[PDB]
């Protein structure tokens, strides 16, 4: 409603670096808000794509940002009559970033890993890795829970059970208020999908450079399964957290599986022990139901509500014809211990191939009316197909079925404006929560400031 579409702020990165693929707000020890941006195709040292991370200070003008420097050198360690190898070429550092306290978590879901023992090997596979930084102090650490030292032959013998070689850990990420990093790995367990949790503080204290393979005792991975419904479901494509059990001491996990049960797609709510509470099933196949999940209380009953994106949903139209436009589902949490029923609201896109639902960001209370609001992206929607971000306001009965404001892309065609979103943070300190939008196609980030309601 009251986002300023006239005087934007533009941050920009190198050409072809995909600057804006992922972003988040970052507060330092003094509460001064900044913006962390991931550029998963930034050139490394060897003139090869490795990705990179930038930490933009807040300036109404915008501009270039300083880099958040990470180690981009391939590593090798000969130990235990084995050779451990990491390959950071084309790893996509910055394909997801997330902030919590004065710490940044930037991940490279396609960092490759291999172990050599004489003539055998573990196979060079993308286990994924995340890099952690404390910008003020300069502390650094890494976390890669799917790294293993089991040779290729053993996996064949034990029939690929517990195969964490293709995790791509860091694909999606989130951090609980208690400080527990939760990585999504859609490729764990041979493209079944796993989740990996570990306290941030334990990551920093149990990391030393050059070790490559080290233990984190407080970590907790999910479990393999022999159920064909989870086969090629990419459990962990998107991840989020919230409160869905009634107990305020436990933190619950929301996981997307957009190809679950033969591309039916699903979303599952779990406890911190990965035990399944509820399971929302997809409505239409290949709709990619679960591509994005968001958690916020939209109806103001203190109970977190759930939002699920299915950006390929094909809407039914006249003459038995379908039209891919995308769709978003709203689930309102019921009072007390009860299952989440049917969707409370269906928001369906309008622009063909617009992918309405590719990204969903809680905005907090934008117009300051008592209900939290959200923003939904259609990165190839709008009358020009350049991209659109629609805002939907909260109300006593859920959400409004029609948008209050629509942000058209200021970038050229193909910018993927809206592919990443983040809101609910006041960055100019005017009392109103703001919105940052990424357009990796144009390698820029646009900041929309919320202003008093006209």
């Amino acid at each position, epitope marked *: 409603l009251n986002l300023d579409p006239v005087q934007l702020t533009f941050y920009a990165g190198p050409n072809g670096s995909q600057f804006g693929f992922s972003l988040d707000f970052h507060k330092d020890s003094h509460g001064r808000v900044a913006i962390v941006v991931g550029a998963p195709r930034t050139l490394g040292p060897s003139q090869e794509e490795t990705g990179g991370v930038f930490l933009c200070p807040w300036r109404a003008e915008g501009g270039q940002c300083p880099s958040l420097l990470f180690d981009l050198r391939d590593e090798t*360690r*000969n*130990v*235990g*009559s084995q050779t451990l190898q990491t390959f950071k070429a084309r790893q996509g550092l910055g394909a997801s970033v997330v902030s919590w306290s004065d710490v940044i978590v930037a991940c490279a879901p396609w960092q490759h890993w291999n172990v050599l023992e004489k003539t055998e090997e573990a196979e060079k596979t993308p286990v994924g890795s995340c890099f952690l930084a404390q910008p003020e102090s300069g502390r650094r650490a890494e976390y890669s829970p799917c790294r293993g*030292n089991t040779l290729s032959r*053993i996996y064949v013998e*034990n029939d690929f059970s517990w195969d964490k070689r293709y995790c791509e850990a860091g694909f999606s990420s989130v951090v609980t208020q208690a400080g527990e990093l939760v990585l999504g790995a859609p490729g764990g367990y041979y493209f079944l999908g796993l989740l990996a949790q570990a306290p941030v503080a334990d990551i920093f*204290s*149990s*990391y*030393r450079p*050059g*070790i490559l*393979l*080290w*233990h984190v*005792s407080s970590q907790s991975l999910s479990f393999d399964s022999s159920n064909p419904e989870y086969f090629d479901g990419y459990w962990g494509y998107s991840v989020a957290v919230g409160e869905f059990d009634g107990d305020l001491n436990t933190t619950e996990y929301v996981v997307g599986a957009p190809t679950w049960s033969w591309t039916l797609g699903a979303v599952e709510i779990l406890d911190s022990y990965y035990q399944r509470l509820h399971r929302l099933r997809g409505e239409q196949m290949a709709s990619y139901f679960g591509h994005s999940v968001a958690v916020t209380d939209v109806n103001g009953d203190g109970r977190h509500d759930l939002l699920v994106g299915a950006p390929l949903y094909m809407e039914s139209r006249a003459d038995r014809k379908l039209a891919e436009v995308g769709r978003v589902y709203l689930f309102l949490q019921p009072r007390g211990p009860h299952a989440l029923g049917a969707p409370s609201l269906l928001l369906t896109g309008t622009q063909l191939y617009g992918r309405f639902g590719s990204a969903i960001a809680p905005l907090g209370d934008l117009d300051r009316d008592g209900y939290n609001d959200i923003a939904v992206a259609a990165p190839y929607g709008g009358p020009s197909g350049r991209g659109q971000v629609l805002v939907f306001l909260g109300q006593s009965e859920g959400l409004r079925s029609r948008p209050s404001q629509v942000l058209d892309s200021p970038f050229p065609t193909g910018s993927a404006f809206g592919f990443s979103l983040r809101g609910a943070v006041d960055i100019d300190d005017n009392g109103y929560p703001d919105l940052i939008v990424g357009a990796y196609g144009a390698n820029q980030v646009a900041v929309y400031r919320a202003q008093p309601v006209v």
Partner: antibody, heavy 119, light 108 residues
Framework: EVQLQQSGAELVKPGASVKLSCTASGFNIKDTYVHWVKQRPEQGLEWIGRIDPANGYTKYDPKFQGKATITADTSSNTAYLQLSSLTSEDTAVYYC????????????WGQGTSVTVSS | DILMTQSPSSMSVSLGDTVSITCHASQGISSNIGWLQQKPGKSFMGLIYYGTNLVDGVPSRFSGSGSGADYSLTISSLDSEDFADYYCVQYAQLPYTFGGGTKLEIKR
């Protein structure tokens, strides 16, 4: 806290067999590797072998092939070392070891089990 | 196997002295070395892993260093508890092999 609580001292005859234990306290034995080390005053320290309790796979120094047999039961959170066809030279103190952070290190040590072979 | 030559076999020193134990290997091990302590008539405690990194709970007066095949354990300002045995162990290759040992003794 991490603590490895081994079995009590054993007193056995040559040619017989003995089976030592190493119970985990404050954690899961399945978490890391488990090594066994032999200590004598003259010969110093010697490395026997290791086991991954998650799957049972083991590695041994060629010197102990035949006498040492390492196993583990995730149920009782305990690891075992079996010695067969005992000898006067098998009279030594036996420790179990696990690493702290590095997958391959030797950091935490049990109190040790005192073995004496004698007729 | 890899031979761990630890030297000296023993040394007589006093409280507050800065002493240095060394460990020489039969081949490069690239900082894949650890350090151990066995107080008289007791078990072992970890000190160093991966050449330089301290084990949780160990004081900062200890320190490891060296590369290739030559490494060094150094104790700045000895304490009354620091009089015990000290062994180096390599894990660059299986089987793991230890040093002969080094006993710190009170000088008088």
């Amino acid at each position: 806290e991490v603590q490895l609580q081994q079995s009590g001292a054993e007193l056995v005859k040559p040619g017989a067999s003995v089976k030592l234990s190493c119970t985990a306290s404050g954690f899961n034995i399945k978490d890391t590797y488990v090594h066994w080390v032999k200590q004598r005053p003259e010969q110093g320290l010697e490395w026997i072998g290791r086991i991954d309790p998650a799957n049972g796979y083991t590695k041994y120094d060629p010197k102990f092939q035949g006498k040492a047999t390492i196993t583990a039961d995730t149920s009782s959170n305990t690891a075992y070392l079996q010695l067969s066809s005992l000898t006067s030279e098998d009279t030594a103190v036996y420790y179990c070891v696990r690493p702290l952070y590095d997958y391959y290190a030797m950091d935490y040590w049990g109190q040790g089990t005192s073995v004496t072979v004698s007729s | 196997d890899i031979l761990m030559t630890q030297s000296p076999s023993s040394m007589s020193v006093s409280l507050g002295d800065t002493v240095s134990i060394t460990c020489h290997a039969s081949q490069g091990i690239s900082s894949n070395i650890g350090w151990l302590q066995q107080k008289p008539g007791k078990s072992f405690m970890g000190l160093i892993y991966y050449g330089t990194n301290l084990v949780d709970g160990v004081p900062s007066r200890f320190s490891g260093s060296g590369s290739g095949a030559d490494y060094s354990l150094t104790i700045s300002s000895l304490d009354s508890e620091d009089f015990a045995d000290y062994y180096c162990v390599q894990y660059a290759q299986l089987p793991y092999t230890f040093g002969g040992g080094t006993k710190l003794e009170i000088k008088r």
